[PDB]
Each structure stands twice: as C-alpha cells, then as structure tokens.
Amino acid sequence: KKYEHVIRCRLSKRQRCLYDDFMAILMQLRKVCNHPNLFDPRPVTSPF
C-alpha cells in the first residue's frame, strides 16, 4: 500500500516585493510565480 503526502510551502520577502512590482505576455508571468527565472535575484558578476 502506498500513500501521498501533502506539504505546503511559504513565500519570502523578495518574492512578495516582486509580486508587488508586477501589478505596479501572460505566459511569462506564470514562470516567475514558481521560481524567479526571468528576473535576476543575484547581483551578478559584472566587470566594473
């Protein structure tokens, strides 16, 4: 016999700041809600 386990997760502060920045292509909005793939959360390696 096998069963399923339901585990619900929470969000963070920068993600909710991004959700505030959205309403401030509809298919591109669905990808960020899972993981921030379009925007860059990293201060990425930039040569000065």
28 part of the interface to another protein, by CB under 8 A: no
Shortest approach of another protein to residue 6 CB, angstroms?
Answer: 7
> Measured from the CB of residue 14, what is the shortest distance to another protein in angstroms?
15
Q: Which residues of 6-40 are buried (b: 16+ CB within 10 A; e: fewer)?
A: eeeeeeeeeeeebeeeeeeeeeeeeeeeeeeeeee
12 binds another protein (CB under 8 A): no
Q: Which amino acid is residue 41, in one-letter code?
A: P
Instruction: List residues binding another protein (CB under 8 A).
Output: 2-11, 30, 33-35, 37, 45-48
